[PDB]
Amino acid sequence: SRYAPEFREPLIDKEYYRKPVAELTEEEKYDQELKKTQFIKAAAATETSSVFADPVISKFTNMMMKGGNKVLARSLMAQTLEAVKRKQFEKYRAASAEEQATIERNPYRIFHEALKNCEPVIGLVPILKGGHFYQVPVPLADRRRRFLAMKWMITECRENKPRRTLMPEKLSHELLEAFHNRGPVIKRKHNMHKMAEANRALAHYRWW
Amino acid sequence: YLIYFPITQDREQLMFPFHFLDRLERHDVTCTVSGGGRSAQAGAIRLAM
Amino acid sequence: AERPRTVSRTSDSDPAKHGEQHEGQHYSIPLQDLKTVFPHGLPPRYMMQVKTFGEACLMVRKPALELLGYLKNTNFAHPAVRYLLYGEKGTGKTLSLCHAVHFCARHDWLILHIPDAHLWVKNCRELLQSTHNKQRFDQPLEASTWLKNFKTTNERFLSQIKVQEKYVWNKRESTEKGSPLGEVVEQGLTRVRNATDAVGVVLKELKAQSALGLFHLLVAVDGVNALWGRTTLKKEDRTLIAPEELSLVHNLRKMVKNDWHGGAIVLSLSQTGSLFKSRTAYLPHELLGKEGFNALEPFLPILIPNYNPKEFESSFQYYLENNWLQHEKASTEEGRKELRFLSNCNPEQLERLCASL
Amino acid sequence: KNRAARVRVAKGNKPVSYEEAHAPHYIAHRKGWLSLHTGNLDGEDHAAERTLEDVFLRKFMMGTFPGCLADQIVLKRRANQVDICALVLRQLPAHKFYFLVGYSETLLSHFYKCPVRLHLQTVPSKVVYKYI
Amino acid sequence: YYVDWRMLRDLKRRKMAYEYADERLRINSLRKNTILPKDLQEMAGDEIAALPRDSCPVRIRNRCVMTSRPRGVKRRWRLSRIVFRHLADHGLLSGVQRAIW
Amino acid sequence: TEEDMDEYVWAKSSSENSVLQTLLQMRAAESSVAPSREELLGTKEVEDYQKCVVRLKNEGENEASLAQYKESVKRLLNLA
Amino acid sequence: SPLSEYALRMSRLSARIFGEVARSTDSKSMKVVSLFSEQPLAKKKETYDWYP
Numbered sequence A: 001s002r003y004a005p006e007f008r009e010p011l012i013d014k015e016y017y018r019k020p021v022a023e024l025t026e027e028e029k030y031d032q033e034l035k036k037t038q039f040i041k042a043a044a045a046t047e048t049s050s051v052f053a054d055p056v057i058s059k060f061t062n063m064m065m066k067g068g069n070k071v072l073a074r075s076l077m078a079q080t081l082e083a084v085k086r087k088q089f090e091k092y093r094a095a096s097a098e099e100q101a102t103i104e105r106n107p108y109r110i111f112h113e114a115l116k117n118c119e120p121v122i123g124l125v126p127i128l129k130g131g132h133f134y135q136v137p138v139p140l141a142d143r144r145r146r147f148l149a150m151k152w153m154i155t156e157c158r159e160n161k162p163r164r165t166l167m168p169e170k171l172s173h174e175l176l177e178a179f180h181n182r183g184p185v186i187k188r189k190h191n192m193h194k195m196a197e198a199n200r201a202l203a204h205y206r207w208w
Numbered sequence B: 001y002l003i004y005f006p007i008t009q010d011r012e013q014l015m016f017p018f019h020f021l022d023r024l025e026r027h028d029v030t031c032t033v034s035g036g037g038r039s040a041q042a043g044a045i046r047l048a049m
Numbered sequence C: 001a002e003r004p005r006t007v008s009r010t011s012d013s014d015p016a017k018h019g020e021q022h023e024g025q026h027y028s029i030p031l032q033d034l035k036t037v038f039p040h041g042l043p044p045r046y047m048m049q050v051k052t053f054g055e056a057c058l059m060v061r062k063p064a065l066e067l068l069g070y071l072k073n074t075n076f077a078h079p080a081v082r083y084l085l086y087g088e089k090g091t092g093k094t095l096s097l098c099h100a101v102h103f104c105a106r107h108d109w110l111i112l113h114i115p116d117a118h119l120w121v122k123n124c125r126e127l128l129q130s131t132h133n134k135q136r137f138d139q140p141l142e143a144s145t146w147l148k149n150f151k152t153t154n155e156r157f158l159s160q161i162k163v164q165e166k167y168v169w170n171k172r173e174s175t176e177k178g179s180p181l182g183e184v185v186e187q188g189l190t191r192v193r194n195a196t197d198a199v200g201v202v203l204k205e206l207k208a209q210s211a212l213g214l215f216h217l218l219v220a221v222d223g224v225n226a227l228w229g230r231t232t233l234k235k236e237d238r239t240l241i242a243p244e245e246l247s248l249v250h251n252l253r254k255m256v257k258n259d260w261h262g263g264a265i266v267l268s269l270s271q272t273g274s275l276f277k278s279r280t281a282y283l284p285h286e287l288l289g290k291e292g293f294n295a296l297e298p299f300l301p302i303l304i305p306n307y308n309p310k311e312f313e314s315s316f317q318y319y320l321e322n323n324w325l326q327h328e329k330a331s332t333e334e335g336r337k338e339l340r341f342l343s344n345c346n347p348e349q350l351e352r353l354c355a356s357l
Numbered sequence D: 001k002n003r004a005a006r007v008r009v010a011k012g013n014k015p016v017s018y019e020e021a022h023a024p025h026y027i028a029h030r031k032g033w034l035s036l037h038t039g040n041l042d043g044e045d046h047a048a049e050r051t052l053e054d055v056f057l058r059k060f061m062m063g064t065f066p067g068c069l070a071d072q073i074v075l076k077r078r079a080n081q082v083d084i085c086a087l088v089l090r091q092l093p094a095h096k097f098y099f100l101v102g103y104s105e106t107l108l109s110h111f112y113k114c115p116v117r118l119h120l121q122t123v124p125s126k127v128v129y130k131y132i
Numbered sequence E: 001y002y003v004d005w006r007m008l009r010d011l012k013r014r015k016m017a018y019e020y021a022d023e024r025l026r027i028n029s030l031r032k033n034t035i036l037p038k039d040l041q042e043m044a045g046d047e048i049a050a051l052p053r054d055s056c057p058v059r060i061r062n063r064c065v066m067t068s069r070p071r072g073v074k075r076r077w078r079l080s081r082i083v084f085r086h087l088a089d090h091g092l093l094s095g096v097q098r099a100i101w
Numbered sequence F: 001t002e003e004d005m006d007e008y009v010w011a012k013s014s015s016e017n018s019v020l021q022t023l024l025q026m027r028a029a030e031s032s033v034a035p036s037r038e039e040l041l042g043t044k045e046v047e048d049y050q051k052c053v054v055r056l057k058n059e060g061e062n063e064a065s066l067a068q069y070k071e072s073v074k075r076l077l078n079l080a
Numbered sequence G: 001s002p003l004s005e006y007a008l009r010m011s012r013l014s015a016r017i018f019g020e021v022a023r024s025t026d027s028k029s030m031k032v033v034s035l036f037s038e039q040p041l042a043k044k045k046e047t048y049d050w051y052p
Ligand SMILES: Nc1ncnc2c1ncn2[C@@H]1O[C@H](COP(=O)(O)OP(=O)(O)OP(=O)(O)O)[C@@H](O)[C@H]1O
Pocket: C043, C045, C046, C057, C058, C059, C060, C061, C087, C088, C089, C090, C091, C092, C093, C094, C095, C096, C269, C270, C271, C272, C347, C348, C351
C-alpha cells in the first residue's frame, strides 16, 4: 500500500459532522479531536455522501464485475432493480385492494430481505485428518455469512440460466423468489445446514 | 458535465464535494482536466473543487 | 410539498385546449388515441412507462406549444412549412413531435408519420431490386411494417381518398383508377414484393390529392437526418449503398419538399441511431450535413431544451404521484437536489436514474 | 551473487581506491563518469565511435605509461578537442614524462585527426580510500 | 587481424555491397514499378541476379566490433550485451548509469 | 463548384434557388401575376434571410445564430 | 468524396510548384521515387564503416 499505517479511513457521513456538539458521545467527541492531528486517506472514487448509496448493493455490484468493467456491472444492477420494480408494479396493479397492501414495490427492500433469507448461520471447513478429507461444522462470522449469500446468488444466475435469458431477468427473478423463501439459492442454504447436522459430532477436529 | 461525463459514477464524484457541505446549486465551476481516463479525470476534478 | 403535484396533471385531454397556462402539466392521451394515433413513433423507454404506469401522459412544454401555434395558423394555400425540432440527446424532441401528431390527428388531418427513419438505412436483411427503376433497391420488410401502422392511423380516410391513376402491380394484378386508396395498401400487405412500391404510390397519391382540398396532410418524419447521410447496407459486390439508391428513402425525400400545399411538415433530428455521426452532435448542420441542410431550407428550427425549474418539479411530482420513486430518501429535499444534479434536468437522464431508484 | 566491477572483501588488508570501492549501482550517486562526451545524450550521433576511441585510448595510456598510472584516466571531449587526465606515480624521471607527453599527444592527434592534450597530476603513491 | 574469420567475411560483404550499391539501385529501380514493359523487367530481374552474392545487402550481419558476437548487440554502440555491461559497470560510458525506479 | 468554395456565397447557390422557388409559389397562391426574379430577391425579407444563412455557413452554427435564422424564416414565410 | 475538375487541376498545379509527383502513380511505382530520394543501406557510413 502507498498509505502508511498511520493513515485513518475517511468518515463520509454527512449528518455526523453537522450534529450539534452536545449530541456526540464523548468517545466520538474524543476521536474527532484526535483525527485533527492525523493523516486521512483520500476517499474512494465510489465513496460519496449520496443518500441513495447502499453499501450492500455496491458490494454486490463489485462481486459481479469482470475485468474491471464497473460500467457494465453497475448497469446490470440498475437493470435488475428496475426489472424488480416493474415486476411488482404489474402485480400491484393487477391485484385486489386487500392483496395490494402486502405487495412490496421497493426494490432496495426486496434485495436486502432476499439476501438475508439466503445467509447461512453455520458453514463447513474442509479438513484432512489422517489422509482423509472431512468437513467440520463451523460457526460463521457476520462477514462470512454475508459473503456466502451474495456469492450463491451471483453463481446461480451466472450458470443455471437459459442461454438467451439475461442477468437482469434471472437475477430479478431470483431476488424475488428468495424474497419469498422459495428459490434455489435458499435451497443451497438448506442443504448446507442439513449437512452440518450430519457432521454434528465431527466439530472436535477443529484446531483454529 | 452531463455531456463530458456520460457515466453516472463520474458525475457522482463531482457531486460529493458540494453535496457533503449541502452547497448544491450555489456555485458555478469552470474546470480544465487534461490527462488520464474518465474515472481519473473526475477524481482529479473532485479534489480540485 | 405536493404543490407542483397539482401542476403535474391537467384535465384538458384535447391537445387544442393547451396553452401557456398548462405548461409543465401532464395531459393524459386517451387510450383509443394510443392504439390509433400512436401505433408507432413513441420512444421505446416511454412505451415501458406507458405499460407500467398504465397511462400515457405527455408534459405540455413551451417548444411544443410554439409548434402547435404555427399548425393552428397554417395557411394551407401557401407551400408547406418544414419545422425542424433540434435539441441535445434526451431533451424530448421525439415526444414534442408526438405532441404535434396528436393535435393534427384530432383535427381530422391525414397522418403520414415515419416513426424512425434511421431504421431504413441500416440492418436490412432482405434487400431486393426495384422493377420501376433497376438502379434502386426495395426493402420489403421495412415498408410492410410502416404500411400496417399507416393503415391503422388513417383507416378512416382510406376509403374516401381514391386513386387517380392505374397501377399495375403484376401481370395478373392491377389497380383500376377510381378505386379506394385502401386497395393499394391492402395489396402491399398481401404481396410483400409490392410493399416497397405500394408505399411509393401512397406517398405520391396523398401529395397530389392533398392540394385538392379533400384533406390536410401532416408529414411527420422523426430522424430525418438519415435521409441525406450515409448507409451501412452493402450491395452484392460488398460495396456500400447510398441513401438515394434506396426506394423508400428516395420517395420520402420528395414528401419533405415544399413544392406542394395543403399541409405541414414536422421534422425531428436524432443523433441516436445515426450512422457516422459523433455522440455530441445535435445541431442541424452537424447532423443533416451540407446536402441535408440545403434540401430542407428554408425551415423553422425549434430548439428543445432541458427541463426548466418548473418542468423539473412537475416531472418529479409525477413520478412520486405514481409511486415510481420508491426509495425512502427520494421524496426528501436532499434526494430531489441530488437527482437534479445527476440528471442535470435532462428528461432522459431523469427517467433513467428514477427507473433504478 | 553479483560479480560486476565489485572488489570483494578479504581480511582487511587489501587497499582499494575510491573508484574501485564503489560498485556499479553507485554510478551517478557517489562516483561520476570517467568519460564525458555528448554522444549518449538524447538525439545525438556517433556514440559507437566515441566509445571505441575511449577503449583504445585507455589501452594506449596503460602501455605507454607501464606501471606509472595511479588510477584510471579521465577523458574529456570539448568540440573536437580531446583531453586526457591521468594520475601518474612519481616513478619515472621528470624528463622521461616530457618525452612521453610529446610522443603520446602527437601520435594520438595524427591517429584520430583531432587535437589531443595530456594532463598529468603526479601523486607520491596510490591514494587508498579504504582497506577492505 | 580481426577478431575471427566470421568478422572477416562480414567486412568483405560490407565492402562489396558499397561498390555495387549504385548498380543494384539502378537495376532494381527498373523492377519496382508498373510503368515499364514486363520484358524489360524480366531481363532486369536477371541482371540483378547475376551480380555477385556478396553484393546483396541482406547478407550483412551486425556483430560486436570487439568480440564478433552475432546476437545480443546494441546498434547504438555496436557492442554485445556482455561487452557493453563491462564498460558501463565501470563508469566508462559517458552518461550511462543503472536504472533504479 | 459550390463544394469547392470555402466561403459560402448565397448568390447563385442552392439556397437562392430554394428561396426563390418558395417565394414564387407564395405569390402564385396569392393569385398575383407571375413576378420577376429580381423583384422577389430584392425585398428586405430576402435580404435578412441571406445574412442569416451566410452566418450559419461562414461565421459558425450555434443556438444563438440558429435563433436569428428562425426569426428571418418567420418574416420571409409570413408566419405568426 | 470525389475530386472535381477544379480540385484535381489545383492539385496538379500544387505538385508542379512543390516538385511532387504530378501524374497518378500506383503505390508500386512510387518506390522508384523512394529508391532515388533515400541513401541506400549499403552507402550509409554506419554500414560500410561498422567495424574499426
Ligand atoms: N414532454 C415530455 N413529457 C414526458 N416525458 C418526456 C417529455 N420529453 C421528454 N420526456 C422524457 O424524456 C425521455 C426521452 O424523450 P425523447 O425520446 O422524446 O427524447 P429525444 O430528445 O427525442 O431523444 P434522442 O435524442 O435519443 O432521439 C422520455 O422517455 C421521457 O422519459
